[PDB]
Write a protein that binds this ligand. Structure first.
Ligand SMILES: C[S@@H](CCCN)C[C@H]1O[C@@H](n2cnc3c(N)ncnc32)[C@H](O)[C@@H]1O
Ligand SMILES: C[S@@H](CCCN)C[C@H]1O[C@@H](n2cnc3c(N)ncnc32)[C@H](O)[C@@H]1O
Ligand SMILES: O=C(Oc1cccc2cccnc12)N1CCCCC1
Lengths: 288, 273
């Protein structure tokens, strides 16, 4: 029950005895949704973070660093695809991945499906620089379970599927039959990327996912690491998965430097794309 | 029973760790030194802070120590004499001593209480301090370099909490200096100023290497890797660690990570071009 001048505290008993906190300057939303607890607040204006959204007590987006995860998920996937015309985003109700995907001129259409219509509604109201994308005629934004949506999608529908979900503990649980559906709705040159969890907190989950996405039938799976200061332990990654064999996602197939928007990006470029697949030695076995 | 870190220069944000046992908590002649055992159900193990800022934990100390120690020595053609300024915990020293080329390392930390407490509470980090190839001094690094002859060291590593010209001077012509380089999230203007200042004092190149450190503010920190000799590209390894016999003992650093560390987010890339 957040209050202006109080502190928002994030502790996860999955990760016992550590917490991160932000002082609240103004509460904008704090209420149960049909699916999760949604909290939006202006952080201290003497600090850099700007507006903050949390879902079930976990920070999802801040103004100051939202571009990292949205650019990495959107560009690492589309720049690894020869011609990504039709795109699906699962989750992504805030709009960020979709903004990045729609930067690409090859994209004719992007479907977005998020289970929580209130996340879209509140992002339009409170994160206009993230959510501007949701009204693009190139986008179809739907409220629904991603699980059901892919089960009812025909084979060979999408070039790229991006799974921009919350974590395994919540409404995103089965998103970690689903992975076979994703394989099946992808076209032959299909690329899938997901929300891939932390090498510090979730390294065994990452090993398990990578192994079983390969076994499901993807020909290759490479984890891309990125720097996100408001995420637990300061990083997160994405598993970038190719349907087709003989594809090296760790070097850009279509370098963003050749596209008109390269200079508008705040994090991603081809050097960062390459660098993101180099993992600390203790985690390198994910990628080999 | 929690340790809370919030800094006055970054207002309205805090990081906290549960204290299981306070091991040490006293001012020193120089700074406040706190050592505690953190929650045994979490990963961090024993924690050391200096003036309220986490400096080492059992769980992640290998990152910053391997990156400073190896990014610098692997960028040097044959590093035989090394100086560490600060480094009282012994971590950078442990990494530097892995290298067969090293004949001698001097380490000069202003605070002898830090070495003392590190021997008591971080034996995996501080064992290096007793090595026959090391000389450990208690003293201010600023005065130490002023009193050091020209061309004494192949590498100077500044692992801290007139000087830079002294560092330039005490380095041999192929000398490498690396330092504790601050955060691109919280200190980006400091990093630009320092990279410019160092180049101005007369190092020929300065390149910032970014690393992932979960317990540092915003989860990363970097090091400026500075070459005295012009024409040196420190962003690719000069002496790849894979060709040395301890490569597989490392938990973070290798040549891919070395190359990767110099790739900066676009918003920060003007630090390196
Ligand atoms: C906010 S977004 C993550 C923040 C970085 N853009 C995560 C979204 O996943 C949605 N989500 C969670 N589970 C599902 C399912 N099952 N289907 C679709 N969308 C889902 C949830 O409502 C968030 O908006
Ligand atoms: C603990 S170490 C940094 C943690 C990563 N190993 C920071 C050290 O720098 C020392 N320090 C600070 N100022 C100086 C000066 N001027 N000289 C030498 N050592 C110094 C300080 O006592 C710490 O032990
Ligand atoms: O990730 C840390 O704090 C956090 C920062 C950001 C988010 C978090 C979410 C849950 C738990 N913690 C979080 N740490 C780890 C290193 C010591 C300080 C606390």
């Amino acid at each position: 029950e957040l209050i202006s001048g109080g502190w928002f505290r994030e502790e996860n008993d999955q990760w016992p005895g550590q917490a991160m906190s932000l002082r609240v300057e103004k509460v904008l939303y704090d209420a149960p949704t049909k699916f999760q607890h949604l909290t939006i607040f202006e952080s201290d204006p003497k600090g850099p973070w700007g507006t903050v959204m949390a879902l079930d007590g976990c920070i999802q987006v801040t103004d100051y660093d939202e571009f990292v995860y949205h650019e990495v998920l959107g560009h690492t996937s589309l720049c690894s695809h020869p011609k990504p015309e039709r795109v699906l985003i699962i989750g992504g109700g805030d709009g960020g991945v979709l903004r990045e995907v729609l930067r690409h001129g090859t994209v004719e259409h992007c479907d977005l499906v998020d289970i929580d219509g209130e996340v879209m509604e509140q992002s339009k109201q409170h994160f206009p620089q993230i959510s501007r994308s949701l009204a693009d005629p190139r986008a179809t934004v739907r409220v629904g379970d991603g699980l059901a949506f892919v089960r009812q999608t025909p084979d060979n529908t999408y070039d790229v599927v991006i799974i921009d979900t919350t974590d395994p503990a919540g409404p995103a649980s089965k998103l970690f039959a689903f992975y076979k559906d994703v394989l099946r709705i992808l076209k032959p040159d299909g690329i899938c990327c997901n929300q891939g969890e932390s090498i510090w907190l979730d390294l065994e989950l990452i090993e398990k996912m990578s192994r079983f996405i390969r076994e499901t039938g993807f020909a290759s799976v490479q984890y891309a690491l990125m720097h996100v200061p408001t995420y637990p332990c300061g990083s997160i990654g994405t598993l970038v998965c190719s349907k087709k064999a003989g594809v090296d996602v760790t070097k850009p197939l279509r370098p963003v430097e050749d596209m008109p928007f390269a200079k508008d990006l705040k994090y991603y470029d081809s050097e960062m794309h390459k660098a993101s697949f180099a993992l600390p030695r203790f985690a390198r076995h994910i990628n080999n």
